[PDB]
Design a protein around this ligand. Structure first.
Ligand code: FAD
Ligand code: FAD
Ligand code: LMT
Ligand code: LMT
Ligand code: H2S
Ligand code: H2S
Lengths: 421, 421
């Protein structure tokens, strides 16, 4: 309301959860902060691959949101938004109730676009997903079915994917786990299929020696690797693959039988957001400026996977660049700062800062990680690392991030770089 | 004097130069700041290898100090200190003049301990040095003499060395340059001799895949590599080498003829500092606390290579861990903060922070770099990188650091990490 702006945060995930705390922290007792999300629990996404192979339980990586935000003065609605009216500034919920806002911060993350590939939905065939804890549990179930009836494995990433790391992670740990069970030799063929123009492209034109190291890794595990692929359909438990050359001409087509599979899908914007007229690009990604403000509605901001980021490269098979945790946080932080400024007269000048990608993968006893910035080469930082220390660091971060989500954040979040002082 | 403390900074190098500016900045007009150094010019040390091979000129990496510090209110004495009396707080200069201090900050860097190896002094035989611009010019001169009369090459690092990177750098660029001159095939043998227990140990038990990558690098260039070596003497243009096993037993001895050589010497403390009673360890390194204060004299601080840092490992052939630029700056910064605190009543609580090593090497079109912290494994950061971008970064830093030394620093120096914002 007037003089007491009501701020809604849509989506309680990696960006949304912290955004809620920071927003409330920033605005204080004179403003209403409401968090709205499809699920009543928070889940630590980077842990889902491990759940997918049964190295982690839901209980380790997920928890109920309500108590933790409410004790901080945040209102929590565990309901999916079906409709957003940007003129009337009304959000229509699944149960039909409506919620008005003065400022809206969209943090809805990605829609998993299984529809791009008929048959690829995890409820439709053998190709599974590790994107969400629900999916990863399903993935693990099918993994156990494979153990009882060994057959071909196919892991990888679809056309239009942007999140490649987890596919490599999943493939490696699956291999690892098979060995641990003494089952690796019952698998007729283990194939890796990706839309990347080469192995270790990672949707960022490679980082450090990701190419050489991921190539050798797949080779060590007896995993056959195909690049420049798009899957045309999944049907009769077979994956129909089309492989192109640099100029997009077909050089071959394959039919791969799948007893067990996991392909990272392309991400689009969620429907309630994509459905807002003039808000998004054709992908359903919110078009925003450097301050995280919608280019169409001054009182709508966006952060995380939900926002549009221009491509810098056009690959033979469509691929996207990933939006990762540190950058998402900078986005969240900027948006909170600029909304608070709006509430106080000034235009917020705060930006997301320099584009970057940071990723950590844990193979069990050792991890791989990378840092690349800015987006185009030559970079200021372009580094790939591997070792037991990267594993120790993943462990540390999950433990830290989860605690922070229970305890609340103020907060210039990443002061965990204080390990220098 | 009383109420107007006189602060002397001894040594105008990587730590000393910034320390002078920061000290003056911190203390302002009410205090006298005096910089004292053996040379009247500043030199950018990491560039010396390139001078050693003639890829850089003295004029590119060195400049006269006086004008730049004096315009900032700093007094400059281009004179070497021969003697420090810590009781009377008097410094005796080369020309016999004496300078009193209320606080002394020692930044004298390393004494190059050629005396450990008879014949190894660059004025005594074929084994040269790239530690200083004077030495690197001499190194390059002998390099040209080798070109006129091709013979055996021997590059590497002595027993007790702590600065290994530059030896690898020098060996690589020498190889490179020989190829460019079409001379590489006139060289009878190119040998790399090091006290490291293995290639790419770097006095830090390795970082990332420094081992594999440096091993392959030397191999690519046709350079034969021996580890666990100590040189017993240089004589009749031959290098006498002794190689031990894990338990320090001799496994072989070699006599290597040298037409052209460069071995990084062991570093000790400079004599005027080592000569202060009870100030240093047997190496001549100033024993200080976490606040950079001498354990023996409350009004003496130290930073840079000059300070003592405990070993964490004992190698078959003695070796030391390097003290590098970022950590030196943290040391300088802490000391300035704590002296200013002293001048104002309180004990300064500021410390150097977490131990770390950062190094950059440029091979011409591409560079290698590393970051390791903290000192012992498993580390929080353990990374090795290579690429054209590392070369671009070295170039950038030299240009930046040199400008900063001419313009003055305040300054929480490393805000050049703002490339994130
Ligand atoms: C498997 C996996 C591994 C990853 N690993 C890394 C990594 O190691 N490091 C890293 O930096 N990045 C990682 N990423 C990338 C990225 O950090 C994550 O995808 C991250 O969770 C993105 O955060 P977000 O806030 O944009 O979206 P999300 O975390 O997905 O949050 C979106 C939220 O909005 C909710 N929502 C969606 N629609 C509605 C609606 N209509 N109404 C109400 N609520 C809705 C969702 O339920 C969800 O809670 C990983 C991604 C995946 C998929
Ligand atoms: C060849 C080389 C390459 C290097 N490369 C890197 C790298 O890439 N990155 C990095 O982080 N580190 C690098 N290092 C390590 C380290 O950063 C440098 O050695 C650095 O210069 C150390 O700074 P310092 O202030 O301790 O000593 P110095 O820079 O050596 O300064 C000591 C100063 O004190 C003066 N002095 C000594 N005795 C007296 C006296 N008695 N009276 C008056 N003045 C005196 C000297 O003339 C000199 O000016 C390199 C080192 C070397 C030798
Ligand atoms: C800073 C202190 C460290 C030591 C100082 C200098 C030591 C000399 C370095 C020698 C390296 C030479 O060898 C070089 O190594 C890297 C391997 O990682 C290779 O590079 C490889 O990984 C990089 C990523 O980092 C990729 O960009 C590249 O496509 C790939 O081939 C080069 O093909 C090889 O030429
Ligand atoms: C974070 C996103 C990136 C992708 C996600 C996961 C991809 C899978 C990673 C597969 C790597 C497997 O292969 C592994 O690679 C590194 C090579 O650099 C090797 O490790 C080598 O370099 C490292 C340093 O980084 C040294 O510690 C090691 O002694 C050396 O052998 C391992 O011997 C090899 O087992
Ligand atoms: S991702
Ligand atoms: S060094």
């Amino acid at each position: 309301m007037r003089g007491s702006a009501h701020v809604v945060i849509l989506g309680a995930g990696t960006g949304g959860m912290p955004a809620a705390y920071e927003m409330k922290e920033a605005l204080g007792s004179g403003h209403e902060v409401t968090l709205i999300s499809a699920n009543d629990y928070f889940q630590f996404v980077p842990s889902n691959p491990w759940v997918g192979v049964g190295w982690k339980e839901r209980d380790d990586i997920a928890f109920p949101i309500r108590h933790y935000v409410e004790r901080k003065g945040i209102h929590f609605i565990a309901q999916s938004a079906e409709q957003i009216d940007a003129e009337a500034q009304n959000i229509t919920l699944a149960d039909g109730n409506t919620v008005h806002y003065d400022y809206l911060m969209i943090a809805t993350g990605p829609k998993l676009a299984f529809e791009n590939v008929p048959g690829s939905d995890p409820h439709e065939g053998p190709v599974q997903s590790i994107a969400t804890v629900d999916h990863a549990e399903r993935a693990f179930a099918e993994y156990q079915a494979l153990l009882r009836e060994p057959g071909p494995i196919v892991i990888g990433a679809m056309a239009g994917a942007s999140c490649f790391g987890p596919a490599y992670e999943y493939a490696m740990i699956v291999a690892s786990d098979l060995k641990k069970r003494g089952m690796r030799d019952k698998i007729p063929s283990f194939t890796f299929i990706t839309s990347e123009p080469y192995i270790g492209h990672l949707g960022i034109q490679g980082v450090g020696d990701s190419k050489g190291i991921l190539t050798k890794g797949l080779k060590e595990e007896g995993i056959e690797a195909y690049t420049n692929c798009k899957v045309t359909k999944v049907e009769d438990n077979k994956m129909y693959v089309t492989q192109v050359d640099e100029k997009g001409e077909t050089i071959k087509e394959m039919v791969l039988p799948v007893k067990f599979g996991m392909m990272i899908p392309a991400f689009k914007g969620v429907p309630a957001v994509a459905g807002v007229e003039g808000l998004c690009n054709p992908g359903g990604f919110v078009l925003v400026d450097e301050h995280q403000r919608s280019k169409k509605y001054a009182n709508i901001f966006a952060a995380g996977i939900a926002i549009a980021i221009p491509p810098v490269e056009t690959t033979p098979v469509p691929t996207g660049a990933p939006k990762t945790g540190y950058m998402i946080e900078s986005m969240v932080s900027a948006a909170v700062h600029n909304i608070k400024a709006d509430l106080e007269g000034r235009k917020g000048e705060q930006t997301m800062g320099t584009w970057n990608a940071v990723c950590f993968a844990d193979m069990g006893d050792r991890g791989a990680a990378f840092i690349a910035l800015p987006q185009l080469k030559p970079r200021k930082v372009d580094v790939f690392a591997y070792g037991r220390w990267v594993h120790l660091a993943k462990v540390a971060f999950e433990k830290y991030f989860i605690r922070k989500m229970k305890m609340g954040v103020s907060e210039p979040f990443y002061e965990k770089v204080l390990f220098k002082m």
